[PDB]
Amino acid sequence: ATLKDITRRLKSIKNIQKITKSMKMVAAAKYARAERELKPARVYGVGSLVSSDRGLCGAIHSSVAKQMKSEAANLGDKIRSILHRTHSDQFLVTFKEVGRRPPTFGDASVIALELLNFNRFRSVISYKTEYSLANIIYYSLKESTTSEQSARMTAMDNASKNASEMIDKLTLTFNRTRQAVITKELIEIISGAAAL
Amino acid sequence: SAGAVRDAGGAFGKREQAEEERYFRARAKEQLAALKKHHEN
Amino acid sequence: RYFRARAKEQLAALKKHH
Amino acid sequence: DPAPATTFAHLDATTVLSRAIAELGIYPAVDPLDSTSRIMDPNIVGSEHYDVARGVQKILQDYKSLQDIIAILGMDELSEEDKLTVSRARKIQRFLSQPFQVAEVFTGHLGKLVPLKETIKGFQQILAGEYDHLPEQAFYMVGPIEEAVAKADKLAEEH
Amino acid sequence: DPAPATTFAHLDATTVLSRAIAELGIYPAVDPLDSTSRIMDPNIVGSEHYDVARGVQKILQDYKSLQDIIAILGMDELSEEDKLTVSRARKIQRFLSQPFQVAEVFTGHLGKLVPLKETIKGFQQILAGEYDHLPEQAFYMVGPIEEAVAKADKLA
Amino acid sequence: DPAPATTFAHLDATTVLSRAIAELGIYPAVDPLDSTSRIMDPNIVGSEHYDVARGVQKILQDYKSLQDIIAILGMDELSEEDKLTVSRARKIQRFLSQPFQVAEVFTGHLGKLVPLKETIKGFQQILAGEYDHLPEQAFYMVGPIEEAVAKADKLAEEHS
Amino acid sequence: KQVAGTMKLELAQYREVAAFAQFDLDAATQQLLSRGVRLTELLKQGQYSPMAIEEQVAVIYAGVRGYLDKLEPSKITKFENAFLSHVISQHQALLGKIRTDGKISEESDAKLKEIVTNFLAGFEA
């Protein structure tokens, strides 16, 4: 590869590394907020007794889709795009703009009203799946958010770390090619002088 | 520097321009419908 | 911050002792 | 390269043509963030000329920073403030394009020639946000701002 | 480099050996998107030979294009259409590898001499999707397609 | 590059000065991890030197890994075993700091010339966990290990 | 050196949290993004118009002490011209002490505090 292609590529991955690195900290802030709000929700949910739009969250959407499609054999806005082309007929209603902000009781109540008319958080790394109906739906969203936020944090961490690995390789390749251009172009000048 | 992803012209650059073109193809269809309804009504 | 507080707590321990 | 690099010092005004801009379909393929002039001054060409010109270069420069974020996230995930920046920027990119009279056989469209005050007013209205409802395709390859609104009517009828 | 670069013109068939392919374990490390031949033509070898050959080179090219996205984001962010393209490509990469008779002393595995007609049938089945259920390492270092299925049966 | 590469062949050791270490008030601002030496070997500098040095070299690497986890996750959600190795590491990096006789004029504090034996047994006792009860600031800017205890004793009297 | 020393620290803190504001967080980090972008506006300067050292400390003093925080980022360029015209016109006595002393004294700080606060109160007339 020529020196210019190495330079443009090295700049490209540096930016993608810097973007993903910041998203790890942003996902951590939303995760930290999600963990504090989940503590009373566990008391609120268990005492009484889906995912999000945002992608780049490891395997939240595939895990829910697998367990959801598993129940077909027995008988946010992302969940539809994964389904749809396989099961358009069993669709009743759909929601959107989910998983952006932390779901409060007011916004969670909108699902309960329209209905009449989830990945549980184990740890940061590992994760697996009228008024009473408003509690079960509230418990599922809070647990799904904390599982989705932790996966984003982990996915963006791996993206920034994998980008850093490629930058280190390209940095060495750049330095080799940098020296080669300096040495080659000098030999052209010496050959030109010697010919005279 | 800024705009380095699209300058490289790699997988991320081509997927980025494809994403923009998709989004604005949708918004173009929505806005043309808005001009239809505004013109008629 | 946490270990900054721990410095004050251990310093209170050696305050009472020594 | 030495040949063009040395020539930059001899020029009062420069028009650096880009291949990346040419391959999008934007003609003339002039780089808006790599073309300068000595007369580009509020005292020489007025403050209204300077602020609008610099305003176009600001949003186009910010548009490049968002494109890097869009590559990973996507357009849908971005905020309303960032979506508005890209919407206006892409229209400004296409409103810069213009069909020449000499290049009628190449393009097919009739040639144009926009006055100074018509040019300044066109980009001023787009930055202010008076054509957010109109599509970006209407600004591509047109004369003044009037024909962009006129072209939007033809596209509305076809759709 | 001038020396190898000039030699290309004096050749009917080329066989480019990549280090990256060798270091992965794929022997012989012949680069499928670099090695070329002049007799490779539907008029000479046939349309079945040609269409299957370019089908292999197409899916390997598509797999190579997605390497940047897999490295940073991952396999999870790819669509279901892409997942199948990657899975088959890795199996096609491994089925290209072959144990040599001369390499019996070095590796230990017995050498294999695959016939012409059986070579085309092997890759054709993988492209169509007749061995998607099997694992990747079953295709690694085998003769014909029959021994690849036999190696998968051994695993359980 | 030829210039450093040619020079690196002749080097027996390195001493990397860092702004990051200087910004934490640790002088001399020597990076303990990045700085290395050829003679760091059991056969050359003895077995005791190598073990204590590697203990300080390991605990600082582990501290840096655990320091990240605090920024990602939080203050707690750390095993008690880790919080001990973090606390000892912060004492160690402070005990690495030292006041110089050269700087007496503009700083004011007396300089120290720590012998080789006092240096090894100083850090050795910290890794074993003999001075865990002492605070972090007791080890900041002192010569031998005896002054670190004597400095901790000048608090508690005139405390707070 | 008094006011600039604080600016260098706050711009360094802003540079770390640069790509965060581009795309909710705690109040501590919100203050850094507030100061950061507003102090960056003060670094902008018109061509062929150099400012005196006494005039420079005044515009930095306002930004770094936190008088621009409640004001909108768009109006920082506008505020600077209005503030600079005010102090040069009606407060030559304060600028005289900064030149002579070469330092923001205890009295000059309290005096400059009064000028900024009162001017900021009735800004958008």
mmCIF file of N, CA and C in Angstrom, chain A residues 25 29-30 33 100-101, chain G residues 19-20 23-26:
data_model
loop_
_atom_site.group_PDB
_atom_site.id
_atom_site.type_symbol
_atom_site.label_atom_id
_atom_site.label_comp_id
_atom_site.label_asym_id
_atom_site.label_seq_id
_atom_site.Cartn_x
_atom_site.Cartn_y
_atom_site.Cartn_z
ATOM 1 N N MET A 25 -18.024 5.644 27.878
ATOM 2 C CA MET A 25 -18.257 6.491 29.048
ATOM 3 C C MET A 25 -19.701 6.991 29.119
ATOM 4 N N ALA A 29 -22.470 6.033 32.052
ATOM 5 C CA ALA A 29 -23.258 7.021 32.791
ATOM 6 C C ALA A 29 -24.738 6.642 32.825
ATOM 7 N N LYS A 30 -25.263 6.205 31.682
ATOM 8 C CA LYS A 30 -26.645 5.731 31.591
ATOM 9 C C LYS A 30 -26.844 4.407 32.335
ATOM 10 N N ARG A 33 -26.907 5.266 36.072
ATOM 11 C CA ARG A 33 -28.236 5.803 36.368
ATOM 12 C C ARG A 33 -29.282 4.688 36.398
ATOM 13 N N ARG A 100 -33.936 5.467 24.711
ATOM 14 C CA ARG A 100 -33.163 6.702 24.589
ATOM 15 C C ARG A 100 -33.015 7.338 25.969
ATOM 16 N N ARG A 101 -34.152 7.605 26.606
ATOM 17 C CA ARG A 101 -34.192 8.143 27.964
ATOM 18 C C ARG A 101 -34.650 7.050 28.930
ATOM 19 N N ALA G 19 -15.852 15.288 22.951
ATOM 20 C CA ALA G 19 -16.757 14.519 22.091
ATOM 21 C C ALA G 19 -18.041 14.057 22.799
ATOM 22 N N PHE G 20 -18.184 14.396 24.079
ATOM 23 C CA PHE G 20 -19.354 14.002 24.868
ATOM 24 C C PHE G 20 -20.567 14.881 24.562
ATOM 25 N N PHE G 23 -22.897 14.418 21.269
ATOM 26 C CA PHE G 23 -24.044 13.516 21.355
ATOM 27 C C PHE G 23 -24.124 12.865 22.734
ATOM 28 N N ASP G 24 -27.510 15.723 30.009
ATOM 29 C CA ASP G 24 -27.985 14.480 30.611
ATOM 30 C C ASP G 24 -27.094 14.014 31.766
ATOM 31 N N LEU G 25 -25.795 14.304 31.678
ATOM 32 C CA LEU G 25 -24.833 13.895 32.704
ATOM 33 C C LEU G 25 -24.953 14.759 33.963
ATOM 34 N N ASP G 26 -24.176 14.412 34.990
ATOM 35 C CA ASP G 26 -24.202 15.117 36.279
ATOM 36 C C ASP G 26 -23.861 16.609 36.172
#
